[PDB]
């Protein structure tokens with residue numbers, strides 16, 4: 213049977229790769245020594261439970277708002293006027309205990325199988341051990357009750373307004389409960405600043421009755437049992453062997469299961485894949501080559517004509533080495549057709565290239581994982597684009613492909629000029645007679661972009677619709693064909709843009725933002741069947757600036 217007790221997972225052993233607790237039973241649980249806490253039963257022997265100080269108990273932290281990274285990876289749809297959807301995390305910890313184990317004798321069943329395997333130096337056998345008993349034991353861990361909530365805002369603007377609205381009306385109440393207050397009360401009203409806000413919570417261990425920051429209507433509880441939150445320290449199970457012969461042989465079998473998919477031995481830095489780990493094309497397949505997830509840049513919203521993309525390097529610390537990232541891109545309108553092919557190594561770092569595409573490599577969250585990025589600066593406005601990415605290892609395997617599809621923004625529209633043209637056109641149509649008027653009316657309407665034409669229509673109909681609609685009146689004064697040529701131009705504007713271009717007012721802000729521009733100093737030595745490691749390529753990185761003109765849409769000019 214399964215011996216379960218509180219604190220709990222400390223005595224059972226932990227796998228690093230699969231991240232699972234309760235893997236076999238490493239240490240024995242006994243009840244000779246008398247360890248109690250509060251309302252909890254008798255603790256197992258040799259584990260030290262220390263409640264965290266009153267400063268840490270029932271404290272909540274609101275994170276800074278950031279774009280929703282989940283919504284920047286696939287088919288990327290978001291309102292251009294809104295911007296990136298934002299998320300903000302709220303987290304409250306309540307029933308906290310720090311749990312260490314010292315000192316405990318080994319389990320009966322653990323030492324039995326440890327006695328028989330010690331002499332029996334076998335690979336398939338040592339892996340079956342790790343499957344059952346895991347790789348480490350947990351040394352230090354944090355238990356308690358945490359409520360983690362995520363507030364999903366539809367835009368960066370909508371938050372800022374709500375945060376400032378909250379900050380005015382509070383100066384008592386947490387930000388999340390103020391929002392939840394207005395969310396639940398909205399059954400009384402309808403559309404407002406809070407329209408698209410959503411809160412999503414996930415609890416690990418139920419909220420105690422005493423703590424008021426994690427209280428949710430039905431779910432309160434008197435003295436809840438603490439749940440594992442963090443694993444602070446792990447120690448490998450080869451510490452427990454007590455002899456130099458087996459604990460070296462076990463260690464190498466552990467490294468095989470972690471780094472080389474259990475189908476190969478690890479030489480310093482790389483996996484020697486035993487045959488036939490090798491794939492369909494006969495290339496070493498024991499170390500996994502992961503899918504690189506192509507993302508939109510969180511800090512740079514794509515404009516019309518300008519898109520910048522990111523991805524985190526898929527290279528493990530040990531095993532596979534990535535030699536290149538292949539990045540294809542096309543404009544759709546097609547399907548299953550190949551876009552312009554770009555080798556990161558060869559086309560983006562080495563061959564210009566510029567000033568339309570630029571690439572960059574940078575140090576990530578915690579080094580050393582690299583953050584590759586590429587920026588497209590000569591794309592076409594109101595266009596749907598598909599970008600795909602895959603990695604290529606040192607021996608020539610491709611990774612699983614990854615995709616991003618997105619629309620570039622609407623083209624810029626001088627809204628003053630549009631309303632001016634509309635009046636010019638109306639006064640010509642009230643002039644009637646002249647063939648110069650007719651020609652010059654037709655010329656000015658055709659000379660300006662389709663979006664501008666759609667906007668002059670919007671204005672023309674706002675004012676002069678009672679005396680004849682824009683198309684109808686264009687047909688009367690310019691004749692059947694010229695009016696149909698005008699009409700057709702308006703068809704070239706998309707559904708998204710035509711919606712946005714019916715706004716009350718359009719204004720133009722100009723953001724100016726930095727991007728990393730890197731070039732290859734050193735052309736690296738490549739073989740026929742093996743290639744050079746991309747990460748080792750010496751590069752010279754310079755910061756540059758893009759100016760990004762955007763339209764700003766609204767029902768009035770006060771934002």
Ligand SMILES: *[C@@H]1O[C@H](CO)[C@@H](O[C@@H]2O[C@H](CO)[C@@H](O[C@@H]3O[C@H](CO[C@H]4O[C@H](CO[C@H]5O[C@H](CO)[C@@H](O)[C@H](O)[C@@H]5O[C@@H]5O[C@H](CO)[C@@H](O)[C@H](O)[C@@H]5O)[C@@H](O)[C@H](O[C@H]5O[C@H](CO)[C@@H](O)[C@H](O)[C@@H]5O[C@H]5O[C@H](CO)[C@@H](O)[C@H](O)[C@@H]5O)[C@@H]4O)[C@@H](O)[C@H](O[C@H]4O[C@H](CO)[C@@H](O)[C@H](O)[C@@H]4O[C@H]4O[C@H](CO)[C@@H](O)[C@H](O)[C@@H]4O)[C@@H]3O)[C@H](O)[C@H]2NC(C)=O)[C@H](O)[C@H]1NC(C)=O
Nearest residue numbers: 228229347448463466467470471479480481482529530580
């Ligand atoms: C869970 O589970 C598990 C448990 O355990 C875990 O696992 C782990 O992990 C970790 C992390 O990742 C790891 O660690 C790591 O490792 C790695 C690898 O290592 C190895 O190898 C290497 C290599 O080398 C090379 O080079 C050299 C020169 O010097 C030579 O010698 C050699 O040879 C090589 O080469 C190669 O080979 C050949 C030739 O012959 C050919 O093929 C070619 O050439 C190639 O290349 C090394 O280095 C090492 O070594 C070590 O050890 C030994 C014994 O064993 C000794 O003898 C030595 O001395 C050493 O030691 C020392 O040093 C080192 C360094 O410094 C250190 O570490 C130590 O401590 C001592 O001191 C081995 O063998 C590595 O690489 C890494 O490192 C890195 O990273 C870090 C962080 O982490 C840092 O700090 C450092 O610095 C580095 O960095 C660098 O690099 C990188 C890479 O790429 C980059 O990126 C950066 O930038 C820089 O530059 C580490 O260390 C481990 O191992 C593992 N373990 C096991 C058992 O498995 C996991 O993790 C977990 N998980 C979680 C927690 O999550």
Ligand SMILES: O=P(O)(O)O[C@@H]1[C@H](O)[C@H](O)[C@@H](OP(=O)(O)O)[C@H](OP(=O)(O)O)[C@H]1O
Nearest residue numbers: 482483496533606607737739741742743744
């Ligand atoms: O020492 P160099 O000039 O870089 O070249 C090495 C050489 O081409 C080896 O044949 C190759 O192993 P395989 O061709 O057998 O894969 C090795 O890969 P490795 O160092 O990643 O094992 C290369 O690094």
Ligand SMILES: *[C@@H]1O[C@H](CO)[C@@H](O)[C@H](O)[C@H]1NC(C)=O
Nearest residue numbers: 213214215237240241320321
């Ligand atoms: C349960 O604990 C006993 C010690 O009383 C131990 O002998 C037994 O093997 C444990 N069960 C498992 C599955 O480890």
